[PDB]
């Protein structure tokens, strides 16, 4: 009856992390996996992400945000790291299982 | 597979009314290799007798009286056979490798050396200064000096402690005689073995040996082989520091059982589990061998190797690593730690691989003719007979976790090890410390 699709859209704008102008992945806390994930990132996307974070920080540090225009739109959010991160995880889970 | 082992040609052996034991293995192979493995060494040397066995090895080729230099070599070269050899602490050998179409010719040659060496007093005075140089070379091979020094302190005071090479003072003064005094004393059939592998037909060998080894034992002595003076193991250290060197080497070890001992198996499996590393490999992902893994992750060593160098009645079960002046410690720690783990909480899944890893070297230990002869040459000499790969198989195809634990601990836990370290080792902690590294705070 109620689209998870319809919902995610909610949460996304609700989380409003796009008001700072940074993709979902630009937020995921940096744990062992993510670090390795991000450390596998192509230098392109890396510097991209960096700036997005520094900009985010700079905003946040000013208490002000990004013009309604520059927010990133849900459908246009680029899961730039999810793919690497996943391999990572399974890579690990593969290892963790083998060491038993 | 197991069938492959079983279908492996038994090794033939039969001694002479003389004393020599003649054994060997047959295959299709045109080529082959054959040699006499004397129960001779440095261990059998004295305070003024040390060196000979070597100074010897070094004239063992420059001719005989029957056929002087230019000819022997010319006769060897000319037939395309390779006559090579060595001399350890309790083992010396001289093997040749021809086309099997030379069994009788190679065999003769063999006999003509182990029995009649020119020992040209003029040939000697040259090989004298040759060794004294060749020794000065063995010297900057830190990869080795570190082992002799290990022996030096590990078995301090006894015969093993003396290095196969012998002091410069002896090599500078060994007499035409003393060499002969060595030859005639140790080079005897009862302690020598004629072994070979390739396309040879035992009987043909026998008869040739039985033919060129016309030795005759009168007394009961001649027919008896002296057992060696026991060497006292001495948990201690010896440090030859020199921050002037690229890096330091470290070698620590516990007393080994001796060939005989059946545990040398489980023990051998032990060393299989931590194995060795060496920066060229390709594995921060390596198999269990954490020492390896960890060696990578934390860039611990340039290279490390585990070894159970054993002898007649004693041994040296340890490990040796090479590392930057700076990561020496972390390494020991991590390494020495492994021994503990090894004999305190080792798992089946581990030993499983260990075994197969051994079973791989077990097999590849016998890869070709020369090598096969080696075992035969050895086997008999130190074990009494020949251990078939079918045997070794079971021996180590039956070692469970609990067995490794029970073993290693039996020779490592709370034992006083012997450490040796040349190079910039300022970072290696005193003894007590690497000593209390022998018991796990269980």
């Amino acid at each position: 009856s109620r689209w998870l699709e319809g919902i995610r859209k909610w949460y996304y704008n609700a989380a409003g992390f796009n008001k700072y102008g940074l993709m979902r992945d630009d937020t995921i806390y940096e744990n062992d996996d993510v670090k390795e994930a991000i450390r596998r990132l192509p230098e392109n996307l890396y510097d991209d992400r960096m700036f997005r974070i520094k900009r985010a920080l700079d905003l946040n540090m000013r208490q002000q945000i990004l013009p309604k225009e520059q927010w990133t739109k849900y459908e246009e959010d680029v899961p730039y790291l999810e793919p690497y991160l996943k391999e990572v995880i399974r890579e690990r889970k593969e290892r963790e299982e083998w060491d038993k | 597979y197991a069938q492959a082992l079983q279908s492996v040609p038994e090794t033939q052996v039969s001694q002479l009314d003389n004393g020599v034991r003649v054994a060997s293995e047959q295959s299709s192979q045109p080529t082959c290799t054959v040699g006499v493995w004397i129960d001779a060494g440095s261990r059998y040397e004295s305070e003024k007798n040390n060196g000979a066995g070597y100074f010897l090895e070094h004239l063992a080729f420059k001719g005989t009286k029957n056929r002087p230099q230019n000819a022997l070599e010319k006769e060897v070269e000319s037939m395309g056979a390779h006559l090579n050899a060595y001399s350890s602490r309790e083992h010396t050998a001289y093997y040749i490798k021809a086309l099997s179409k030379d069994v009788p010719k190679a065999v003769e040659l063999l006999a003509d050396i182990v029995q009649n060496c020119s020992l040209e007093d003029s040939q000697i005075e040259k090989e004298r200064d040759v060794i004294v140089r060749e020794l000065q070379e063995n010297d900057t091979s830190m990869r080795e000096v570190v082992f002799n020094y290990l022996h030096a302190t590990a078995f301090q005071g006894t015969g093993l402690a003396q290095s196969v090479e012998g002091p410069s003072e002896n090599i500078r003064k060994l007499s035409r005689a003393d060499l002969t005094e060595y030859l005639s004393t140790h080079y005897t059939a009862p302690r020598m073995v004629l072994a070979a592998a390739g396309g040879v037909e035992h009987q043909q060998l026998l008869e040739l040996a039985q033919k060129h080894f016309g030795g005759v034992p009168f007394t009961y002595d001649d027919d008896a082989v002296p057992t060696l003076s026991k060497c006292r193991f001495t948990g201690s250290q010896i440090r030859h520091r020199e921050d002037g060197l690229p890096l330091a080497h470290v070698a620590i070890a516990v007393e080994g059982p001796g060939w005989a001992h059946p545990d040398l198996v489980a023990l051998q499996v032990a060393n299989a589990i931590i194995g060795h590393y060496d920066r060229t490999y390709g594995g921060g992902l390596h198999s269990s061998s954490p020492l390896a893994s960890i060696a990578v992750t934390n860039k611990l060593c340039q290279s490390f190797q585990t070894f159970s160098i054993c002898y007649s009645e004693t041994g040296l079960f340890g490990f040796y690593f090479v590392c930057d002046r700076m990561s020496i410690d972390d390494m020991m720690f991590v390494l020495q730690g492994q021994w503990m783990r090894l004999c305190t909480s080792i798992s089946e899944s581990e030993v499983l691989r260990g075994k197969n890893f051994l079973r791989n070297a077990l097999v590849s230990h016998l890869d070709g003719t020369t090598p096969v002869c080696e075992d035969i040459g050895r086997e008999l000499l130190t074990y009494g007979r020949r251990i078939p790969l079918e045997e070794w198989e079971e021996r180590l195809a039956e070692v469970d976790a609990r067995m490794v634990r029970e073993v290693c601990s039996k020779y490592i836990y709370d034992q006083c090890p012997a450490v040796a370290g040349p190079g910039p080792i300022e970072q290696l902690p005193d003894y007590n410390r690497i000593r209390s590294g022998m018991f796990w705070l269980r």
Binding site: - | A4, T31, G80, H82, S287, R353
Partner: protein, 406 residues
């Protein structure tokens, strides 16, 4: 029952020669030889071979860098890769049923290398050392340069990635270098301790590429180069050569016997503390022949000179038909001997199952070497003395001469 089982060879519809030989050894070893190498590199992509040779352990599509290494080790396995300017041999060894399993990884390492951009971008700094260790051997140094001074274009290219390119090889240059040389026509799934029906039923999965000859390495133009490396090592290494002999080239065997015909001569021709030998390398469309002379500094001039005069007066009739009989036999030896060790042996059933597709029995391989003698040699030597010479050298050298000083 006697251990004899004729080595069957069956050329697949691709060009993938499959050579086996059940010799009944407990430990068998499979090997994928290829006509790849550092001969197919251009002024760019250099060393991509070498690097590749190391990327052996990098994740594939059927098994992760992890699985593979621990996979092979969980069996007492051994994967390794031997390569030469014009050929890369991916061997693997184990025993029993474990051969079957040991395969999965060799299969993936050679055909499904997905060289991930990080793994390599994190593996490249290895070249610095892998090379650094190999270069502790002065000998390898002089040779690397020899080929440089002996050629100009493919082949003359280094075997160990040049420095300047240590971290510039791209994850791409790797696929691109493989997609073009690791192709059925130029590969061979050789092997030992195996039943051929099984070693064949594997080539079925190994069927993932066809392109006969993807990039074919340019012919090798010769050059009379000379490149000295002043570095004062108290002892000079020197090598001299005259282009010649090619694998399969009937003119080959000759030097081999001249290789032996030479040696006791150059050596016994140069008294003092040294070492010297007859150098011989046979490549696909070329080769080399000469002699390297490790010799003390100041006594470097003399040494090479004398070593040379000998290769000289060897052409001007100083070779009894006896010297030939003796030397003809040593090869019979060195050949047969260096075949005992299943790895130096599997190297023979391979080399051939690659360059030809046949297998010259030990009988005729002799009948061919036996085949010539007096007839050549004296002359093979002459070829050296006349043609153009290219020298290589490492050491104090200040006392070592140049080719223009013969």
């Amino acid at each position: 029952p006697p251990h004899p089982q004729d080595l069957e060879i069956t050329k697949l519809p691709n060009g993938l020669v499959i050579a086996s030989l059940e010799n009944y050894s407990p430990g068998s070893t499979i090997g994928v030889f290829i006509k790849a190498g550092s001969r197919y590199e251009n002024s760019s992509n250099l060393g991509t071979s070498h690097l590749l040779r190391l990327a052996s352990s990098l994740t594939t599509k059927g098994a992760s860098s992890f699985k593979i290494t621990r996979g092979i080790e969980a069996v007492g396995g051994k994967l390794s890769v031997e390569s030469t300017r014009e050929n890369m041999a991916y061997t693997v060894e184990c025993l029993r049923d474990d051969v079957e399993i040991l395969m999965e990884f060799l299969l993936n390492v050679t055909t499904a290398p997905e060289f991930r951009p990080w793994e390599v971008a994190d593996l490249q700094p290895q070249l610095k050392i892998d090379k650094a260790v190999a270069f502790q051997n002065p000998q390898t140094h002089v040779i690397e340069n020899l080929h440089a001074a002996a050629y100009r274009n493919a082949l003359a290219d280094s075997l160990y990635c040049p420095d300047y390119r240590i971290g510039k090889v791209t994850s791409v240059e790797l696929h691109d270098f493989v997609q073009n040389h690791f192709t059925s026509a130029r590969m061979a799934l050789v092997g030992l301790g195996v039943s051929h029906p099984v070693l064949k039923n594997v080539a079925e999965q190994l069927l993932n590429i066809r392109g006969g000859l993807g990039l074919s390495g340019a012919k090798a133009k010769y050059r009379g180069g000379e490149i000295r490396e002043q570095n004062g090592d108290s002892l000079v290494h020197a090598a001299i050569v005259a282009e010649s002999a090619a694998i399969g080239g009937a003119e080959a065997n000759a030097f081999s016997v001249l290789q032996h015909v030479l040696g006791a001569n150059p050596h016994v021709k140069r008294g003092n503390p040294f070492d010297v030998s007859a150098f011989n390398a046979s490549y696909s469309d070329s080769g080399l022949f000469g002699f390297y002379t490790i010799s003390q500094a100041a006594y470097a001039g003399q040494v090479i000179k004398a070593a040379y005069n000998q290769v000289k007066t060897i052409a001007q009739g100083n070779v009894s038909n006896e010297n030939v009989q003796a030397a003809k036999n040593k090869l019979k030896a060195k050949y047969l001997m260096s075949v005992e060790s299943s790895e130096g042996f599997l190297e023979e059933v391979g080399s051939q199952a690659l360059a030809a597709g046949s297998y010259n029995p030990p009988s005729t391989v002799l009948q061919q070497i036996d085949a010539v003698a007096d007839a050549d040699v004296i002359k093979a030597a002459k070829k050296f003395v006349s043609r153009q010479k290219s020298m290589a050298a490492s050491g104090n050298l200040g006392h070592t001469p140049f080719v223009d000083e013969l």
